Amino acid sequence: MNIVLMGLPGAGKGTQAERIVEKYGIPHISTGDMFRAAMKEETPLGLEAKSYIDKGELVPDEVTIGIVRERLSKSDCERGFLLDGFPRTVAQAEALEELLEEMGRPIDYVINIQVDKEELIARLTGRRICSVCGTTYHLVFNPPKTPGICDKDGGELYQRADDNEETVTKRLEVNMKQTAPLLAFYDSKEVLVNVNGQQDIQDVFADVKVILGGLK
Ligand SMILES: Nc1ncnc2c1ncn2[C@@H]1O[C@H](COP(=O)(O)OP(=O)(O)OP(=O)(O)OP(=O)(O)OP(=O)(O)OC[C@H]2O[C@@H](n3cnc4c(N)ncnc43)[C@H](O)[C@@H]2O)[C@@H](O)[C@H]1O
Numbered sequence: 001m002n003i004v005l006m007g008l009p010g011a012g013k014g015t016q017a018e019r020i021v022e023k024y025g026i027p028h029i030s031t032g033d034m035f036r037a038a039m040k041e042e043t044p045l046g047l048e049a050k051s052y053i054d055k056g057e058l059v060p061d062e063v064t065i066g067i068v069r070e071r072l073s074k075s076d077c078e079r080g081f082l083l084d085g086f087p088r089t090v091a092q093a094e095a096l097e098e099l100l101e102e103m104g105r106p107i108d109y110v111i112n113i114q115v116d117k118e119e120l121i122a123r124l125t126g127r128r129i130c131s132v133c134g135t136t137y138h139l140v141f142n143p144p145k146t147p148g149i150c151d152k153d154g155g156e157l158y159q160r161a162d163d164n165e166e167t168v169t170k171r172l173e174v175n176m177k178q179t180a181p182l183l184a185f186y187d188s189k190e191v192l193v194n195v196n197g198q199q200d201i202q203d204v205f206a207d208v209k210v211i212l213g214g215l216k
C-alpha cells in the first residue's frame with residue numbers, strides 16, 4: 001500500500017494518517033513533522049527550512065526531495081508507506097514518480113481530502129496542541145473538557161506558530177496555487193481519489209478504508 005495523502009492546509013491529513021497507520025501498519029512519512037523536528041533540534045537543514053515555514057512558504061524542492069528520497073531509503077517502506085504532505089508541487093510529484101519507478105514502489109492511490117476553504121481557515125486558527133503530550137484539540141470541533149488545558153495531563157494548550165490568521169492565509173494561497181496542477185497530474189495517472197473531509201473524523205476514515213480495503 002503506497003499512498004499519498006494530500007489536501008489543503010488544515011484538511012485533516014495528520015488526523016487521517018494516524019488512523020491509517022494504526023490500522024494498516026505502514027510508515028507515516030510527514031514532511032511537516034520532519035521539518036518541525038529539524039527546526040526544534042536547530043540542525044542546518046532545520047534553520048534553512050525555518051525561514052520558509054515561518055512565512056507559510058514551501059521549503060525549496062531541492063532539500064525536500066532529498067530528505068524524502070532517502071526516508072524512503074528504508075526497509076520499513078517495503079510494506080508500503082503513507083506520504084503526508086509530499087508531494088505538493090508537480091516538480092515534487094515528478095521527482096517522486098521517477099524515484100518510485102526505479103525503486104519498484106509506484107503509488108497506488110493519491111487520496112485528496114476536500115474541505116471548503118472557510119472551514120480550513122477555522123480548522124487551523126482554532127487548532128490547539130498540548131505542550132505536554134502533543135495531543136491535538138480544536139476550540140470548536142474537538143474542545144478540551146476545560147478550555148486551554150489538556151484532558152490527559154493538565155498541560156497548557158498552545159496555538160502552532162504558523163496557525164495565526166496571516167500565516168494561514170499565506171499557506172492557503174501558496175498551496176491552492178500548487179494544488180491545481182498537481183491534482184491534474186495525478187488524475188492523468190489515474191491514481192487520484194477524492195474524499196469529503198467535512199465529516200466527523202470517523203466518517204472520513206470510513207471512506208479512506210473503502211479505498212484502501214482492496215490493498216490489504
Ligand atoms: N512537500 C513539502 N515541500 C515544501 N515545504 C513543505 C512540504 N511539506 C511541508 N512543508 C513545509 O512545512 C510547513 C508545515 O507543513 P504542513 O503541516 O504539511 O502544513 P499543512 O498541509 O498546512 O496542514 P496541517 O498539516 O497544519 O494540518 P493537517 O491537514 O495535518 O490537519 P490536522 O489533521 O492537524 O487537523 C487540523 C485541525 O482540524 C481538526 N480536524 C481534523 N479533522 C477534522 C474533522 N474531520 N472535523 C473537524 N475537525 C477536524 C484537528 O483537530 C485540528 O485542530 C508547510 O507550510 C511548508 O512550509
Ligand SMILES: [Zn+2]
Pocket residue numbers: 130131132133134135150151152153154155
Ligand atoms: Zn496533553
